[PDB]
């Protein structure tokens, strides 16, 4: 799930203060006019309509999204493995782990065993995957880049360091009311949070 | 500690010291994670976390919690404060309400922020027992020796003091907290930025028309929304946050054992849950034939369970299996 | 345990910067910052700032915005005030102090800095022994009268330091344009004169050192 | 933008209890104010007492603590020090600033009177060949710190051409001054009795040089 860690906005006096499209993820910024901040004294800003605010808010990866966080996947199909106990004849004993394919052995004990390939070619896992700390999901996850908002993936980041994410929130901030700070962001709330 | 404008502030929207930012009702274990615009902790210098500064006037007052509240829906329990930031054990509610006493008056902070505590589990309480298995819950600690994270916390911009823009007995006069930073002018043309001790007006009079600033950079704020820019530079003050979500194993849930019954391949199950349990098995033939159903009524129900086997999963409750030769 | 131990008194004509140290002891200097406060003659004690000696960040009064500069040499513990284009009305002692406890535990000795117009004249030393004739008592005084210089400060001791216990040094006072300073030292009769005793001036804006002993009359 | 007052000046007598208070011009001192209370005692020596309203400093004695009493931080002397004779100064933090009080003056009873040790010297010869001459009148130890000092070139008051310092507090408590006489090699030659007359808590001390 997102978090709209909001830039505190600008507030010219009197005058336009013109916004740029900061390289934030999903840098929605949106100037506005017409205002009479309401700061601790009153208003502060002497004009009246050229009275200035410039809203900016980004998304950003939550502090969840480092430990809470579903996860993607492209699953191809790989290659299976089994810690197959045999207790032996008379040896008795041998608890190892192996592989399927149809070639390997592993001498752990005394005795070589060649494994598999099985005929059941059953991934059960999808080829598409979502993944939830210990909940798996075949899901048909649309993609990095392109989750759209509210829906699942509305925050696509590759890993939890990656700085550069896909945030399609729909933000869109609006201008405070009657002459107050505060900084309006409608927002879909996350489709993490839903899907959960 | 950082005042901004707190939305329903008891009457409306005041500035109240304790405005109330990122509420984070995310985790499971009944808390919240709460930002305070008010930086209790320490004393202004050096002593005891468990006092309390907010800002009154320009100024702190940096003196004891004694009687802080957090609240929703029911009254809150603290959990811990560090820095700007308090964690709490909260009911669902929807909405947040937080305030301390100061001691001549209430001063509180509310909000509106959707609330909920699903414990993590099949069963869908609202509230955490004393007893049941413990699993993988999302949480936040008690600790403050916390790196996990960090916020960006740069300057304060300018605010509002027009306690500063008094009379000179005809032209109005600005003075200084201590010597700090007054910017400064009115509608009329007199002084045109102000960075001074106490000047004084030539040109206008009306304390209504003009500049009443107070660029105090000696202490960095959080980045409120609810903060004006400090329009010269991003400065310095990348500071941490306390309350990182952790993998507690919650203390958690557990539905009461399930009415084994038998019958030809058919599992009758008179069962009869304390909150709404999310059943679902697994027919393990190759043919998956799942289930699933939030139980919170009793409710017999039955599975046509095959000849290899079937699973079952009674909640959290670990999940059975079953032979139905 | 805890010393903070300041540079010594200057003199300055207008206009002028001066670098006052704060050289910090006992305490590890980055977990305990510095307050500066201007104990103006008159007036009273004032809080002039306080700089974060972990990050460098330095607070002003609103007073000391300006020509008021906190730095710190971190590395051998000491923090610097300076204060630029001097205004006469800046003569004062300033304190450096050690925030702790929820207040300050700790003050400096003092820096005391006299803004004044005036050229550079070194002192004149001169010995004072006791009258002429006899001066029979269990012990004696003996003194020492440094006149006539400019600005301060100067130091003043006897036998290079190891002779401190009955010393007076008498403050410094202008008078005509100058500075008059002296001291007093008493002994018991056996030390002086059998013992040597001798008076060290030393006046840093000059370049003046005297030592001068005090020899008997006769 | 507050005021901090403390009371002016308080006399107390060894033994006794005395309160100080310290006084913010905006409300009452509450604990989030932490003050702070430092003595000044003389050579501008600075020691912190108490700071976050109620703690003392280590090594501070016990007869030392710091509270509120109504609206206001208050400083309490228990069983008052002779030693305890100095300036106290209370400090109020106001949310990013200190202010600080005027400062108490507190006398305590003790130190049993001393009387002053006068020492009166000769020009000295290098400095008579300067074609000057400077008398030089020392007392020291005195208590209490108040003397008159009086001159008198061959019986005769002198008046001007004397000058003579403030009583300093040495570290012992008792007080110290100087007094200079200038005359001119030549005036010195001219008379020949010269004198240096202290007047202490009634006795009168007079040193007399004979050239």
């Known amino acids: 799930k997102y978090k709209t860690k909001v830039p505190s906005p600008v507030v010219k006096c009197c005058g336009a203060t013109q916004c740029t499209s900061k390289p934030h993820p999903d840098y929605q910024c949106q100037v506005f006019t017409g205002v009479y901040p309401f700061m601790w004294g009153g208003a502060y800003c002497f004009c009246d309509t050229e009275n200035t605010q410039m809203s900016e808010a980004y998304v950003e990866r939550s502090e969840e999204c480092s430990i809470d966080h579903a996860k993607a996947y492209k699953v191809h199909t790989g290659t299976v493995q089994a810690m197959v106990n045999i207790t032996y004849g008379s040896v008795s004993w041998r608890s190892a782990d192996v592989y399927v394919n149809g070639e390997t052995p592993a001498k752990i004990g005394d005795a070589k065993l060649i494994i598999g390939p099985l005929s059941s070619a059953w991934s059960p896992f999808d080829n598409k995957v979502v993944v939830y700390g210990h909940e798996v999901y075949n899901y048909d996850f649309p993609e990095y880049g392109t989750g759209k908002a509210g829906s699942f993936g509305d925050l696509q980041s590759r890993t939890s360091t990656s700085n550069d994410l896909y945030a399609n929130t729909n933000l869109k901030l609006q201008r405070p009311q009657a002459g107050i700070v505060h900084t309006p962001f409608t927002q879909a709330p996350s489709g993490f949070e839903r899907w959960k | 500690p950082y005042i901004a404008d707190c939305p329903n502030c008891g009457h409306s929207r005041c500035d109240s010291p304790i405005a109330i930012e990122e509420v984070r009702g995310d985790a499971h274990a009944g808390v919240i994670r709460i930002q305070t615009s008010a930086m209790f902790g320490l004393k202004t210098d050096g002593v005891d976390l468990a006092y309390m500064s907010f800002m009154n006037g320009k100024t702190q007052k940096s003196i004891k919690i004694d009687n802080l509240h957090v609240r929703t829906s029911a009254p809150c329990s603290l959990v811990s404060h560090h820095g700007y930031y308090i964690l709490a054990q909260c009911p669902p509610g929807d909405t947040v309400t937080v305030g301390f006493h100061d001691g001549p008056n209430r001063h509180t902070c509310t909000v509106a922020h959707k609330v909920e505590f699903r414990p993590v589990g099949r069963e869908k309480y609202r509230h955490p027992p004393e007893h049941g298995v413990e699993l993988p819950c999302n949480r936040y600690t008690h600790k403050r020796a916390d790196q996990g994270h960090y916020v960006e916390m740069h300057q304060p911009g300018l605010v509002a003091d027009h306690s500063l823009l008094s009379i000179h007995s005809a032209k109005v006069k600005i003075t200084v907290p201590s010597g700090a930073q007054v910017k400064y002018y009115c509608k009329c043309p007199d002084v045109r930025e102000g960075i001074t001790s106490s000047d004084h007006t030539t040109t206008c009079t009306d304390v209504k028309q003009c500049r009443a600033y107070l660029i105090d950079n000696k202490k960095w704020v959080y980045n409120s929304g609810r903060l004006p820019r400090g329009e010269g530079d991003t400065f310095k003050g990348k500071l941490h946050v306390p309350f990182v979500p952790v993998k507690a194993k919650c203390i958690a849930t557990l539905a009461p054992e399930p009415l084994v019954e038998h019958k030809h391949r058919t599992l009758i199950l008179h069962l009869h849950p304390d909150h709404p349990t999310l059943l679902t098995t697994r027919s393990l033939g190759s043919d998956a034939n799942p289930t699933r159903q939030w139980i919170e009524r009793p409710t017999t129900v039955n599975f046509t369970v095959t000849g290899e086997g079937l699973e079952y999963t009674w909640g959290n409750h670990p999940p059975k299996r079953v032979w139905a030769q | 345990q805890i010393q903070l131990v300041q540079s010594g008194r200057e003199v300055k004509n207008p206009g002028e910067t001066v670098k006052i140290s704060c050289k910090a002891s006992?305490?590890?200097?980055?977990?305990?910052?510095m307050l500066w406060v201007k104990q103006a003659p008159g007036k009273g004690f004032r809080w002039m700032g306080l700089?974060?000696?972990?990050?460098?960040?330095?607070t002003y009064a609103e007073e000391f915005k300006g020509r008021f500069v906190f730095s710190l040499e971190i590395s051998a513990s000491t923090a610097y005030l300076q204060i630029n284009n001097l205004t006469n009305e800046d003569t004062a002692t300033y304190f450096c102090?050690?925030?702790?406890?929820?207040?300050?535990?700790?003050w400096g000795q003092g820096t005391t800095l006299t803004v004044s117009s005036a050229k550079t004249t070194a002192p004149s030393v001169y010995p004072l022994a006791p009258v002429c004739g006899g001066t029979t008592g269990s012990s004696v005084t003996l003194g020492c009268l440094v006149k006539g210089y400019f600005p301060e400060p100067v130091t003043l001791t006897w036998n290079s330091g190891s002779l401190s216990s009955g010393v007076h040094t008498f403050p410094a006072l202008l008078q005509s344009g100058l500075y008059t300073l002296s001291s007093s030292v008493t002994v018991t009769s056996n030390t002086w004169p059998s013992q040597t005793i001798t008076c060290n001036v030393a006046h840093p804006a000059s370049s003046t050192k005297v030592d001068k002993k005090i020899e008997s009359r006769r | 933008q507050a005021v901090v007052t403390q009371e002016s000046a308080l006399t107390t007598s060894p033994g006794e209890t005395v309160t100080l208070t310290c006084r913010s011009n905006?409300?009452?001192?509450?604990?989030?104010?932490?003050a702070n209370w430092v003595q000044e005692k003389p050579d501008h020596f600075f020691t912190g007492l108490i700071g976050?309203?109620?703690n003392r400093r280590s090594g501070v004695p016990a007869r030392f603590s710091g509270s509120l009493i109504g609206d206001k931080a208050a400083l309490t002397i228990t069983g008052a020090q002779t030693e305890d004779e100095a300036i106290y100064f209370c400090?109020?933090?106001?949310?990013?600033?200190?202010?600080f009080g005027g400062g108490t003056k507190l006398t305590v009873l003790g130190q049993p009177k001393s009387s002053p040790s006068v020492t009166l010297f000769p020009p000295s010869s290098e400095e008579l060949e300067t074609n000057k001459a400077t008398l030089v009148c020392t007392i020291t130890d005195f208590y209490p710190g108040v003397v008159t000092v009086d001159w008198k070139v061959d019986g005769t008051p002198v008046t001007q051409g004397m000058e003579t310092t403030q009583p300093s507090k040495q570290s012992n408590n008792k007080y110290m001054a100087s007094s200079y006489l200038t005359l001119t090699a030549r005036a010195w030659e001219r008379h020949s009795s010269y004198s240096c007359q202290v007047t202490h808590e009634g006795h009168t001390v007079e040193k007399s040089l004979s050239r």
């Open positions: 400090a109020l933090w106001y949310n990013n600033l200190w202010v």
């Open positions: 976050d309203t109620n």
């Open positions: 006992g305490y590890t200097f980055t977990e305990y910052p």
């Open positions: 905006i409300g009452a001192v509450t604990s989030s104010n932490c």
């Open positions: 102090v050690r925030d702790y406890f929820i207040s300050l535990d700790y």
């Open positions: 700089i974060y000696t972990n990050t460098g960040e330095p």
